[model samples]
Target chain A: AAEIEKRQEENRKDREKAAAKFREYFPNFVGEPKSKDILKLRLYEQQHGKCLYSGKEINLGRLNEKGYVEIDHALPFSRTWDDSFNNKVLVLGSENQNKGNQTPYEYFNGKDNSREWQEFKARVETSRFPRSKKQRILLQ
Target chain B: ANKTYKIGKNAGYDGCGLCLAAISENEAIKVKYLRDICPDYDGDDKAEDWLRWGTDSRVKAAALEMEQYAYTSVGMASCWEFVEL
Candidate 1:
């Protein structure tokens, strides 16, 4: 019985480790081992349940049900490939899709200083993990 | 017994048209790659805590989908497949 228990414990640890590996590759990926759901929930709270781009509320129902909330790379993951928390922000699914592959300045600046654009810039300024110095400059 | 992972074509790419795409279900594999490739691994934060590893524009894209949640089954659709060694 003891030997069987020991193997079970080791197997449990292996499972957790494997799950962690999956999360590393896909942060916004929905569905999980319950643990990933927990991790995602932690991130949700960390951001105060707000969309970084719009500074609007992010509903948990949308997060799990409709996939409205997604992990977005503030600096354009295409350009930096940096996935640190400082570089990540949660945003609405539509906004993330629309902002695709474009830097915040490139996408937001084109809108003539829209409210969301302004808010996004502000968040970047105050963000603990801003991507780079170059991203800080206002592009002409 | 470590399971292998393959990169799929549907993997998203960054603005520079680069994909830092990598996939593996193996804990030992993940740890070694994190230590070797991720700069944040040695810093104050843990790599598993936060860090996405597609570092260069030249990197290729490989999409992944979770088949059986919880790190048990993940697959690259029509791109590449990995087998346990």
Candidate 2:
């Protein structure tokens, strides 16, 4: 990826390219749910009314009279094109933002293999074992 | 659910929570500047559940700010992650 890195470096050095890339990536990506409402509903149910990002418990009360939950992408729509029912979750506003477009590998690496991550692994291996089964471990 | 997510370490420290989600599957969802609240642990045994909800504003604002910082910052990482819906 050094060649890619070199190209990226050149792109970074060029303000116009960087700006264009950001614009290209973000676009006018307003709130438009990508999956079917039923799938959204299933994800909402599975998360137990919790936001996957911040771990906040959400409910009909938090949202307006519509009485609905928002579907959050584990990875951004722009980051990757792999949105499906399983990959989606019901998340509160904060969780989505804090955990934005960051894969676990990126997040853990950015945070480093600190105690928090180790604790997370332990917690998953224990209480949430089934959920943990689908986990992806990078850093290999 | 469990799925692997890869992101940058030794990367930009522009955002708060310095966080990312380890999602379960391959799915796409939408996100913008997001927020989270990790409450200060006051040595309370119940502190494990101390995590609380914060307004989307803090997360959004901080993330947006980080985006701005990212433009000027160096040693920024190339990868990123997102939350599963």
Candidate 3:
């Protein structure tokens, strides 16, 4: 019986570990796990705490306040279902709400050389965005 | 043990796995996780054991259905149980 109890405790620890691994890979589990928060923090640092949409500063301490550090899909999840971290970027929640289901390209309406488009692209270039995310933002 | 657990809420993620032993059943053991009470063990083949675990129709089917539900319109605090056979 003691051995059984010991094994049971060990199994419980293993389950938590396994769930961590799962959430690490799929941050959009949509239900539970702390890995998503960790991933978002890492992503925020990679972006130097800049919002991809508004070029605004993101305060880590004030994340719980009105407006927030939001992880958004550069390609838009509705259009592509590409929620992988590679396809995501950190932005302000206010800007995220404005972007809605539209891709960054459409949101900026930069079909050609325009000032907002050029500036947005430059911001993305300077950001420590991953290669794929950089390409997604520019889409050129 | 083939049993269907009526999952209950607790503090965190463990609520699902922690509330199963009190269903008036004996040998009700947890494999792991607060939400999981299924018996996951090494099967006939090593890598094929993941295959064996998959072969249990209700286990995988049940897990997938719950996942889909949570992913769709009914997630966050929605609670459901598992049938570990």
Candidate 4:
């Protein structure tokens, strides 16, 4: 257990180094952001204040007011360290909660044929915004 | 460990990209640590067992550990490319 803790500590420092280099290379990379809240706001505007998963219209002003909206990673941070705008989308807090850490492809690409999945698929197919690696996988 | 995944040779059972990444990033973890952490061995004959194992907190946490290591050590976008296999 001590060894694992030691490794985890070492990993934290190494991650800092990696993140710096990562930031230098991909300024818009999404793993770490200057301010996640601000980034969420930016995504909110880009999506026209619509929930990416449910296709529900949301109030931009109410985004940070409460549990109105959330920033969702299309691929999931667990799978990819990607935290860039391309990997992000805005969704209702409730919908985002339901989505959990599942990749769009994993959760929504099933044969369930639910209305929510259909709407999400349609939006992804026709959206003019950029896509992250995870979203692109779903598209494929 | 070996770059290409071997059938019935590795300790991991989940074919998902996250599981692949966990095993691929570190040979030591794949060969040594995984068995220690996961209570339910994923290599069971029944697929249902693996499904339950995948949802096990221990399994998920172990997989996340590998992901953190891969991302921090190698700057891999993901441990493995997302592909339907």
Model 4 chain A weakest 10-residue run by lDDT: A30-39
Q: What are the lDDT figures for the candidates, one per model?
A: 0.42, 0.36, 0.48, 0.47
The model with the greater DockQ, 1 or 4, is 1
TM-score of each: 0.41, 0.35, 0.48, 0.42
lDDT by residue for model 4 over A75-101, one digit each (tens)?
Answer: 654455454446657677666556555
Pitting candidate 3 against candidate 4, the one with the higher lDDT is 3
* Candidate numbers sorted by lDDT from highest down: 3, 4, 1, 2
Off by over 4 Å in 3: A1-33, A64-67, B1-85
| Model 1, CA-based lDDT | 0.42
Cα lDDT tens digits for candidate 1, A44-91: 655566766666787765555445665545564324434443555556
Ranking by DockQ: 2, 1, 3, 4
As a whole number from 0 to 100, the lDDT of residue A109 in candidate 3 is: 77
Categorize the docking of model 4. Answer: incorrect
Clashing residue pairs, backbone N/CA/C < 3 A, model 4: A30-A83, A30-A84, A31-A83
Q: Is candidate 1 or candidate 3 better by DockQ?
A: 1
lDDT of 1 at B41: 34
Error of 3 at B46 (Å): 27
DockQ values, each candidate: 0.05, 0.07, 0.03, 0.03
How many clashes in each structure? 6, 34, 4, 3
